[PDB]
Amino acid sequence: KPLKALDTRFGRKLSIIRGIVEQEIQAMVSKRENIATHHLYQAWDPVPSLTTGALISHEKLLLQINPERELGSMSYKLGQVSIHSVWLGNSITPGVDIHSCSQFLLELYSRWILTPAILISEVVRSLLVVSDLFTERNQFELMYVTLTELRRVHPSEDEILAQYLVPATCKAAAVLGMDKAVAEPVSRLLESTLRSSHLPSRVGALHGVLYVLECDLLDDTAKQLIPVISDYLLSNLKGIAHCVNIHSQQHVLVMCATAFYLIENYPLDVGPEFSASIIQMCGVMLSGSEESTPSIIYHCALRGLERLLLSEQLSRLDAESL
């Protein structure tokens, strides 16, 4: 969300100075996929306003860009449409006709699911990718029903289907109201898929965790199956504390992004020792040499740390440590 610390008589000067700093960071660091020419003043974020509206300037969205994304990189990266945008773009809260094409696709993929394994894997991956364009709650209902039917029919020893299926089921559940009959198999699914050996299964399950934890005021029994994820985050920040060049790149990055999201928007559900250990492990992560921790990991973890600083949630001793 846009922050509380801005819009003050003090905050505007801070936005100016950090606009200058991040402006020539994106001159130095960033990856000109938006940009073709060579000019200095080319910072551009395609975030629209929100029945669509105009385009938001880069100096107004100072820290809105998610920590899952490389600086100024433009590609599909599983976090394009937030469910804020799903709930308030199309008014559902618990000039091409794209809607007819999406209905015809749901008919086709629901008939093909209900065929070899390769087509089923590519159809569920297709359905998760095309799932940004759905403008009706009944479409997400049919999505979740067909995916639970595929989970019941298709066997369990197919992890490629799992790594293309878990974010689709989690987002189809997250657009809907997160009721107990929906929250039990989704949380059971996430707790099962976080123990797997396939690494983008973990990546897709953790993006699905980010979709579930995103906006829905969540069940008090289902938020008690959060600290499985917190124990996962503690173990895989202690493991990847020293060496980052060895393990992986996008796993650590998305994993720190959801860790920072859990510190920001759900404080009380986890203990303060968890946020303290994340600040300690990221202080270790910033303190690596220029060949140990890469530039993208460094800048994303750093941007998440000042994102947590501009939030009014953290205590003063962790602020002094930062």
Binding site: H38, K77, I118, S121, V129, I160, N245, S248, Q249, P294
Partner: protein, 268 residues
């Protein structure tokens, strides 16, 4: 029991390569690696993991190079990274670092091709550190590819660090011989272009930079033009730099032409 099942998974993987799908033949090669992890084999498990790596990288060469997909979002890049991570760990456990360095070179060449040069810089410097005790010329070529990746990704100070490291490791092992002199020529041109692009203060100006900037302020034509261009940028004489870019364009490769274009740009 396990070996016959591994041969069955190998036949399934060959049938799927004949069917040419390839997210799922790699799953069978991971099954072959798991079966040869069930007993103790060694390099055959590494072969199964590297064949799975070849299949996932071929999936993304089909999904980003032959088909520039807007829906492509790097799902078997991560599986190829985990598989080659397991293979490099297995080679470092058995004790042969040349194979692990070869796999890091393959992964970083794949990430250079897919349009992501920093992680290529990345694994190239990792492989060049894995080849310094045994094969220093292969380490110089891995560092040269790392430096080209960093000049692609606009990390010029990292390119200074890599180029000075290349020149130091070429002087320790060239006393030149051969292609060590080609390494030295490429470094002695490109460090001067990078010292003219970013002009360091004398605090962060290391004495190797001081020695070569005292040397200029390699064949005779390009050496003469580099001396003239250092003397032109110290005097800020733009017409001379124009008449040098017209006459240094055939003499340089495309990376040096990019660096000389940047030097001519950021002084006008």
């Amino acid at each position: 029991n396990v070996a016959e099942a591994g041969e069955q998974f190998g036949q399934l993987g060959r049938e799927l390569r004949a069917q040419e799908c390839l997210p799922y033949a790699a799953w069978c090669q991971l099954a072959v690696a798991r079966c040869q992890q069930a007993l103790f084999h060694g390099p055959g498990e590494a072969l199964a993991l590297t064949e799975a790596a070849r299949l996932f990288l071929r999936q993304e060469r089909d999904a980003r190079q032959r088909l520039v997909c807007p829906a492509a979002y790097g799902e078997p890049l991560q599986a190829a990274a985990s598989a080659l991570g397991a293979a490099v760990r297995l080679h470092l456990e058995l004790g042969q670092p040349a194979a692990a360095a070869a796999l890091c070179l393959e992964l970083a060449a794949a990430l250079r091709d897919l349009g992501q040069p920093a992680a290529a810089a990345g694994h190239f410097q990792r492989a060049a550190q894995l080849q310094l005790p045994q094969l220093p010329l292969a380490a110089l070529q891995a560092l040269g590819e790392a430096a080209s990746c960093q000049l692609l990704a606009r990390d010029y100070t990292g390119a200074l660090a890599v180029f000075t490291r290349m020149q130091r490791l070429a002087r320790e092992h060239g006393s030149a011989l051969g292609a060590f002199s080609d390494v030295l020529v490429r470094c002695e041109v490109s460090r001067v272009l990078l010292l003219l692009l970013l002009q360091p203060p004398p605090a962060k100006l290391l004495p190797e930079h001081a020695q070569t900037l005292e040397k200029y302020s390699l064949p005779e034509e390009l050496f003469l033009l580099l001396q003239s261009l250092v003397m032109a940028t110290h005097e800020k004489d733009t017409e001379a730099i124009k008449s040098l870019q017209v006459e240094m364009w055939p003499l340089l490769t495309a990376e040096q032409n990019h660096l000389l274009h940047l030097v001519l740009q950021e002084t006008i």
